[PDB]
Design a protein around this motif. Structure first.
Motif, PDB file in Angstrom:
ATOM      1  N   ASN A 106     -11.540  -9.262   1.745  1.00  0.00           N
ATOM      2  CA  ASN A 106     -12.068  -9.006   0.395  1.00  0.00           C
ATOM      3  C   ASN A 106     -13.312  -9.725  -0.316  1.00  0.00           C
ATOM      4  O   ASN A 106     -13.868 -10.591   0.421  1.00  0.00           O
ATOM      5  N   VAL A 107     -13.661  -9.358  -1.375  1.00  0.00           N
ATOM      6  CA  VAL A 107     -14.971  -9.834  -2.198  1.00  0.00           C
ATOM      7  C   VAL A 107     -14.900 -11.342  -2.002  1.00  0.00           C
ATOM      8  O   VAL A 107     -16.169 -11.814  -2.125  1.00  0.00           O
ATOM      9  N   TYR A 108     -13.800 -11.919  -2.171  1.00  0.00           N
ATOM     10  CA  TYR A 108     -13.851 -13.354  -2.424  1.00  0.00           C
ATOM     11  C   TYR A 108     -14.058 -14.202  -1.015  1.00  0.00           C
ATOM     12  O   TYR A 108     -13.868 -15.394  -1.108  1.00  0.00           O
ATOM     13  N   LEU A 109     -13.887 -13.411   0.183  1.00  0.00           N
ATOM     14  CA  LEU A 109     -13.312 -13.956   1.397  1.00  0.00           C
ATOM     15  C   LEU A 109     -12.256 -14.978   1.111  1.00  0.00           C
ATOM     16  O   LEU A 109     -12.154 -16.081   2.053  1.00  0.00           O
ATOM     17  N   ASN A 153      -4.860  -0.258  -4.013  1.00  0.00           N
ATOM     18  CA  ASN A 153      -3.667  -0.681  -5.019  1.00  0.00           C
ATOM     19  C   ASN A 153      -4.712  -1.282  -6.027  1.00  0.00           C
ATOM     20  O   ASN A 153      -4.090  -1.688  -7.234  1.00  0.00           O
ATOM     21  N   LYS A 154      -5.815  -1.934  -5.925  1.00  0.00           N
ATOM     22  CA  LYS A 154      -6.641  -2.316  -6.981  1.00  0.00           C
ATOM     23  C   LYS A 154      -7.409  -0.947  -8.029  1.00  0.00           C
ATOM     24  O   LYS A 154      -8.101  -1.482  -8.688  1.00  0.00           O
ATOM     25  N   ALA A 174      -4.838   2.414   1.610  1.00  0.00           N
ATOM     26  CA  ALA A 174      -5.488   3.695   1.917  1.00  0.00           C
ATOM     27  C   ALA A 174      -4.286   4.376   3.381  1.00  0.00           C
ATOM     28  O   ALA A 174      -4.014   3.662   4.068  1.00  0.00           O
ATOM     29  N   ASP A 175      -4.736   5.565   3.240  1.00  0.00           N
ATOM     30  CA  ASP A 175      -4.197   6.416   4.359  1.00  0.00           C
ATOM     31  C   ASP A 175      -4.735   6.104   5.656  1.00  0.00           C
ATOM     32  O   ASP A 175      -6.123   6.449   5.740  1.00  0.00           O
ATOM     33  N   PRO A 176      -4.268   5.576   6.732  1.00  0.00           N
ATOM     34  CA  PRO A 176      -4.781   5.233   7.976  1.00  0.00           C
ATOM     35  C   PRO A 176      -5.457   6.570   8.742  1.00  0.00           C
ATOM     36  O   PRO A 176      -6.326   6.345   9.428  1.00  0.00           O
ATOM     37  N   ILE A 177      -4.785   7.698   8.743  1.00  0.00           N
ATOM     38  CA  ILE A 177      -5.445   8.891   9.040  1.00  0.00           C
ATOM     39  C   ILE A 177      -6.845   9.021   8.485  1.00  0.00           C
ATOM     40  O   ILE A 177      -7.851   9.637   9.113  1.00  0.00           O
ATOM     41  N   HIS A 178      -6.890   8.855   7.368  1.00  0.00           N
ATOM     42  CA  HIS A 178      -7.946   9.224   6.419  1.00  0.00           C
ATOM     43  C   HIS A 178      -9.047   8.093   6.906  1.00  0.00           C
ATOM     44  O   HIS A 178     -10.291   8.561   7.174  1.00  0.00           O
ATOM     45  N   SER A 179      -8.652   6.843   7.231  1.00  0.00           N
ATOM     46  CA  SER A 179      -9.527   5.947   7.663  1.00  0.00           C
ATOM     47  C   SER A 179     -10.245   6.194   8.782  1.00  0.00           C
ATOM     48  O   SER A 179     -11.449   6.150   9.025  1.00  0.00           O
ATOM     49  N   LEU A 180      -9.168   6.579   9.833  1.00  0.00           N
ATOM     50  CA  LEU A 180      -9.595   6.994  11.202  1.00  0.00           C
ATOM     51  C   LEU A 180     -10.835   8.051  11.117  1.00  0.00           C
ATOM     52  O   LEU A 180     -11.746   8.157  11.792  1.00  0.00           O
ATOM     53  N   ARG A 181     -10.550   9.062  10.316  1.00  0.00           N
ATOM     54  CA  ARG A 181     -11.632  10.261   9.979  1.00  0.00           C
ATOM     55  C   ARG A 181     -12.905   9.617   9.466  1.00  0.00           C
ATOM     56  O   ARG A 181     -13.949   9.949  10.049  1.00  0.00           O
ATOM     57  N   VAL A 182     -12.937   8.784   8.705  1.00  0.00           N
ATOM     58  CA  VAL A 182     -14.104   8.098   8.119  1.00  0.00           C
ATOM     59  C   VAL A 182     -14.803   7.700   8.950  1.00  0.00           C
ATOM     60  O   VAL A 182     -16.014   7.637   9.227  1.00  0.00           O
TER      61      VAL A 182
END
Length: 166
Positions: free
Chosen positions: A37-40, A98-99, A131-139
């Protein structure tokens, strides 16, 4: 090389059902990717597991980074030490659905991988990022040109990703 047991999806993307921590400990890759995340703040998910495996050294280093440089951007990254897991850790921030963060930034997140020849990585924006993991894999497949070894912890998800791949 030392990555074993992966299924080949494309010329450059490989996938395995494995715990990314155990796989980093076994392979000692040049680069492991953290789902940051952006704050590590490495509290949960992949980040919490990687940090715990470093005995909190990753968090101490990250706090110094933020104090000096400020937060990352969604879609951005930084390269820090890999501690006992890898030579380097590429901390990449995917959008957190979720944010309300813009899913289009997932492509920008994966573009960071192209600065490294070989990476061990999780699926970005999956799990607690919503996010949907199928979409993440495609990207991933459509964006990354370097060699990426994906570790997917959940066996039921792994089977779904492989069997739906197109």
């Amino acid at each position: 090389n030392s990555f074993s047991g992966y299924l080949k999806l494309t010329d450059n993307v490989y996938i395995k059902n494995a715990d990314i921590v155990e796989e980093a400990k076994k392979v000692k890759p040049t680069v492991v990717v953290n789902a940051a995340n952006v704050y590590l703040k490495h509290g949960g998910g992949v980040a919490g597991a990687l940090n715990k495996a470093t005995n909190n050294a990753m968090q101490v280093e990250s706090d110094d980074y933020i104090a000096t440089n400020g937060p990352l951007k969604v879609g951005g990254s930084c390269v820090l030490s890999g501690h006992n897991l890898a030579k380097h850790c590429l901390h990449v921030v995917g959008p957190n659905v979720n944010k309300g963060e813009d899913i289009q930034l997932l492509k920008s997140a994966y573009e960071n991988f192209n600065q490294h020849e070989v990476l061990l990585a999780p699926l970005l924006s999956a799990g607690i990022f919503g996010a949907d993991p199928i979409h993440s894999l495609r990207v991933c497949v459509d964006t990354v040109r370097t060699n990426v070894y994906l570790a997917v912890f959940d066996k039921n998800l792994y089977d779904k990703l492989v069997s739906s791949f197109l």
